[PDB]
Amino acid sequence: GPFTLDHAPRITLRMRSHRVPCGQNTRFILNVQSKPTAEVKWYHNGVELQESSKIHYTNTSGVLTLEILDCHTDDSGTYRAVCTNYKGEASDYATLDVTGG
């Protein structure tokens, strides 16, 4: 059948928790495989993230990137990507530790 190969999102490359010196820009990367293609939502400490001068995420054929610019203490904490399709969901979280330069 046309929907036999449909499957819940599968994250094959997960985000890496990491440190960044205060003031630098930093990135999280993950890769999801999903049929049909999954909806993607980003969160910082539980609150859904939007594109802004501070936050830029991309999504190219499942390759997902989140950039945070000019990192300060407020930017520390948990970043979570949640990938959803009708078959199920996959979530990945990682921690950003903003440190001294």
Instruction: Return the DSSP state at 53.
Output: S
Total number of domains constituting the chain: 1
User: What's 22's domain CATH number?
Assistant: 2.60.40.10
Handedness of CA 98, 55, 27, 31 (dihedral sign): positive
Provide the residue range defining the domain that includes 85: 1-101
79: left (phi over 0), alpha (psi -120 to 50) or beta: beta
| Spatial CA neighbour of 89 closest among 32, 22, 26 | 32
Q: Is 68 helix (H, G, I), strand (E, B) or coil?
A: strand
Last residue before each gap in the chain (C to N over 2.5 A): none
Bridge partners of 77, per DSSP, are 96
| Spatial CA neighbour of 30 closest among 16, 45, 50 | 16
How deeply is 22 buried, as exposed, middle or buried, from its count of CB atoms within 10 A (0-12, 13-18, 19+)?
A: middle
Q: How was this structure determined?
A: X-ray
CA atoms of 26 and 24, how far apart (whole Å): 6
R_g (Cα) of the chain, nearest Å: 15
Cβ atoms of residues 96 and 68 within 8 Å: yes
Bridge partners of 82, per DSSP, are 41, 91
